Amino acid sequence: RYGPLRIKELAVDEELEKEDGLIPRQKSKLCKHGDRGMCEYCSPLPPWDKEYHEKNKIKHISFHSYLKKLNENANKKENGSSYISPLSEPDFRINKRCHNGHEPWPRGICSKCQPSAITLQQQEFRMVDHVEFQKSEIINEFIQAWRYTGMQRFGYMYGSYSKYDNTPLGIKAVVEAIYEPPQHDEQDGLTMDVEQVKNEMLQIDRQAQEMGLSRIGLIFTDLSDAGAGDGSVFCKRHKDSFFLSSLEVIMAARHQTRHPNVSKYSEQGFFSSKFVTCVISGNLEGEIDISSYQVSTEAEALVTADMISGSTFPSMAYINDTTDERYVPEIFYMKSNEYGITVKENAKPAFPVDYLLVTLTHGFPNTDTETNSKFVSSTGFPWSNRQAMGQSQDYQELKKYLFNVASSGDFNLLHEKISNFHLLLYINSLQILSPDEWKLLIESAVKNEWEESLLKLVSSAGWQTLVMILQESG
């Protein structure tokens, strides 16, 4: 297209692209030159300088900085080319139609459409840098689920992305709420039919988009109780053990492949979904520390063409066998030894998954800053699908929870009770409220300057009917 592709993407990408991120440096004591004129040590440091990152204890390079590096590496202006897209998502599937004179793969292949050997290697750029939980309650309730039932859990985490000043051109995913799909949790694992999950999540995500959220990851708990007097949990995931066994890696790769990130610098228009997965395991001590991870782009394009399956060894992923419709070339994984030489080891029977991951830094908002949480809620109306526990959404709980506040007034108190994510979802599910009335409800419950909108809402006949039936109902 005679230049860079034309498409509209997230605002974070645009604003990051506008910046250049150069880190200025002052006159070094080793310079030999007048005030003006910078020689080699006084020049600005590019944002992708690996030395700075590894010197500041940052293990990855804030993907946008990687994009800047790639653009600088080539694509001279005014001449030298007609623009070559610098980013391309690797694809391993055999070209079903090459036809230099041969027939399709099932009964014929040439050397031009043969998937070349794949060299697994740890990725160097992580798309999303910092995953941030707005409030401790959001995950405290989730862990309380396990406390009460004892079984594991699993839930998507909606939220939005923004800049992250602490890292060069870094991004942070702020999670606002957690929604628990219908799943059959158990002592050692959890199970859930994919069809129901996707069907439900389609409408749930539509409603969330209407509210201004977005599905930005999945969080599951892998916790076991220790023998100490208090509540302590073993640390089964450390350097020696497996950080993430095969199956969770596979599921994360599938999820990433199904949540592509739209980008302006690829032929297809997408690259390396901004999807973050969080796991709760417990730190070296008995705490309930959390963690974050993200499977690299090669693993993203590796699971799509099958080629991987779980192995009885937790820390290693099995490799499948060649067959029609699935061609699996030799997989070499590259590591580094203590002598500073890269070694390629063939691992067909099984290979560790440490080369298919990048780790993110979890955290919580500073407790001495402005509060921009969408929802001051999540300690109230029980969450959606806690049928296994006693929690159950229904008229009676609404009557017990959100009746006395509305029946009198005190709108300041009411607002916080109306800004609860699951409450909004439930009332929308009832379908009592009219579409536009619900739209103004969400605009009042997820936005400031809400006095007039809240008054209008309580004016609309829909809310009158809601409160009347709620009071009448036991």
Binding site: H33, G37, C39, S43, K76
Partner: protein
């Protein structure tokens, strides 16, 4: 005020302290002497595109980007570039070749790209690439993949900058052939500047500049030092000054104690450099510029060459009229002679005549002695015939004086010289003089038209020539008052200039011997006639009769044809 600066005020305007004291940069045009031509060329190529770009827009031309600058090491190339950069008062990005080549693979290209991009950001800019021969060497010598990668990166960046940009690139190298040839085409390092050894005035200026802070003694005769020092590049002069200071310190060490950490200030006040210190430094100096062919600066006139009046006027007509009066040649459409070859017995003073001719048109001079030609033939020398002619072109007008040409022209070198001569630009005023003692032994191919076709015979001096030579040689030597040399001249019929110089040297040696013996036994301010008489008695003609007869027969045969 000056140096783009805007008692305290005067010091600030240049009209911890250690960081600036050791960083006394901003060396202006007052820190360079003896290179007025090269400095003027560099300033014209650099300042005007940056200071006054409007002229080029008005006329509608693209100012040259590259400015290659090559010369013998230690001649102040980097200092000159730094002075230009500071005086222009514009952004400039240093790049030292060894540093760029002393980094891990995959980062030298990054440094070069960053340099060029940054210089582009803050236009106007001046990128000074030092020791460019260390990052873009000749292809054959360095086949390393990384070197080829760096060369390709540099070429790409050089090509990609020539677009509405105010970036001027200055490069320094020892020889014009060391750099890869690909960096000497259109839109690249095309405009070249050659720096030659300074002359007497240049050496005097350099000594004046260096010896401004030193506490010189009142008995300093810098003129004598300039006259004595020949082939001294600036670095040699600086080392000479350092050696003189060290010698003075050693002489004054008798009144100082090594063990004591402190040194008396009164003793320090007595550190005065004397002419003796400079003479000792000259004794210990080791100049090396002449080891390679370089562009000199001759100043001989039509007074050191006696006789040869017909030859003098013929050379004037053949050389000066083209250079000085190209209008008439263009009017008549006559191509000036491209060279001339001198033949005759050795010691007749061919070199003096060639140097005088070169000085007449006020042009530089290049000397290529026979041993250097032989070394190039054996391939064990840095320079080359192509390099010699490239330097001649860059320093034009010039006179290239090939010496002992019979040694090589009894093959590869002869053919290469013929190629260089034929490919030379006829219009450009560059002349090739040749010296030989065996004109017949010279390869006939050289004497073809468009080459050293002109033949000039240099005869042995006559009585008047001998008298003139004796008078000239004894200018710097005292003689007995009222001493006549006509008798010596007539008694020395058939002798050559070398023989006369040997006679004078032997007479002076006897005089100094007598003076030393008398002083040791302890008066002889002059050289009495007995010294010259004995020297004449103890000298012999260096030319056998047979060679003279064959030379005159060959000359007569040439005349007859």
């Amino acid at each position: 005020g000056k140096k783009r600066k805007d008692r305290v005020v005067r010091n600030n305007l240049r009209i911890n302290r250690e960081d600036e004291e050791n960083n006394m940069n901003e060396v202006g045009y007052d820190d360079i002497g003896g290179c007025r031509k090269q400095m003027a060329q560099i300033r014209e190529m650099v300042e005007l595109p940056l200071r006054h770009p409007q002229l080029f827009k008005a006329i509608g031309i693209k100012p040259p980007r590259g400015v290659l600058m090559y010369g013998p090491p230690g001649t102040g190339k980097t200092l000159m570039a730094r002075a230009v950069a500071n005086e222009t008062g514009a952004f400039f990005f240093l790049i030292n070749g060894p540093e760029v080549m002393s980094k891990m693979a995959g980062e030298s290209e990054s440094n070069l790209r960053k340099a060029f991009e940054e210089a582009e950001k803050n236009a106007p800019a001046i990128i000074f690439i030092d020791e460019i021969d260390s990052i873009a060497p000749k292809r054959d010598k360095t086949n390393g993949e990384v070197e080829r990668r760096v060369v390709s990166q540099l070429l790409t960046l050089m090509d990609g900058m020539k677009a509405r940009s105010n970036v001027v690139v200055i490069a320094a190298t020892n020889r014009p052939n060391s750099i890869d040839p690909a960096l000497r085409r259109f839109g690249r390092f095309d405009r070249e500047v050659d720096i030659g050894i300074p002359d007497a005035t240049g050496r005097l200026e350099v000594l004046r500049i260096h010896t401004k802070n030193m506490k010189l003694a009142d008995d300093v005769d810098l003129e004598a030092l300039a006259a004595e020092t020949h082939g001294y590049v600036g670095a040699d002069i600086a080392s000479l000054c350092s050696e003189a200071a060290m010698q003075q310190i050693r002489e004054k060490m008798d009144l100082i104690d090594l063990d004591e950490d402190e040194i008396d200030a009164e003793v320090l006040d007595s550190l005065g450099v004397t002419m003796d210190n400079f003479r000792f430094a000259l004794g210990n100096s080791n100049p090396s510029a002449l080891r390679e062919t370089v562009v000199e600066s001759v100043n001989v006139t039509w007074d050191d060459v006696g006789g040869l009046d017909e030859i003098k006027e013929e050379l004037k007509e053949t050389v000066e009229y083209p250079v000085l009066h190209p209008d008439q040649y263009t009017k008549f459409g006559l191509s000036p002679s491209k060279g001339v070859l001198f033949y005759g017995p050795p010691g007749t003073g061919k070199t003096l005549l060639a140097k005088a001719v070169a000085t007449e048109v006020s042009a530089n001079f290049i000397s290529v002695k026979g041993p250097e030609l032989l070394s190039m033939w054996y391939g064990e020398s840095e320079s080359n015939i192509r390099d010699i002619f490239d330097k001649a072109r860059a320093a034009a007008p010039t006179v290239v004086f090939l010496d002992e040409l019979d040694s090589i022209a009894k093959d590869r070198v002869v053919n290469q010289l013929l190629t260089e001569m034929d490919g030379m630009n006829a219009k450009k005023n560059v002349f090739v003089i040749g010296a030989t003692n065996r004109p017949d032994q010279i390869d006939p191919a050289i004497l073809r038209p468009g080459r050293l076709d002109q033949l000039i015979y240099v005869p042995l001096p006559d009585e008047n020539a001998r008298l003139s030579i004796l008078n000239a040689q004894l200018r710097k030597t005292p003689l007995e008052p009222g001493l006549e040399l006509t008798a010596i001249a007539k008694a020395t019929q058939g002798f050559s200039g070398a023989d006369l110089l040997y006679i004078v040297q032997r007479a002076a040696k006897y005089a100094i011997k007598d003076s030393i013996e008398a002083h040791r036994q302890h008066p002889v301010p002059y050289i009495t006639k007995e010294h010259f008489a004995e020297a004449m008695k103890t000298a012999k003609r260096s030319v056998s009769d047979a060679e003279l007869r064959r030379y005159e027969a060959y000359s007569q045969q040439m005349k007859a044809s």
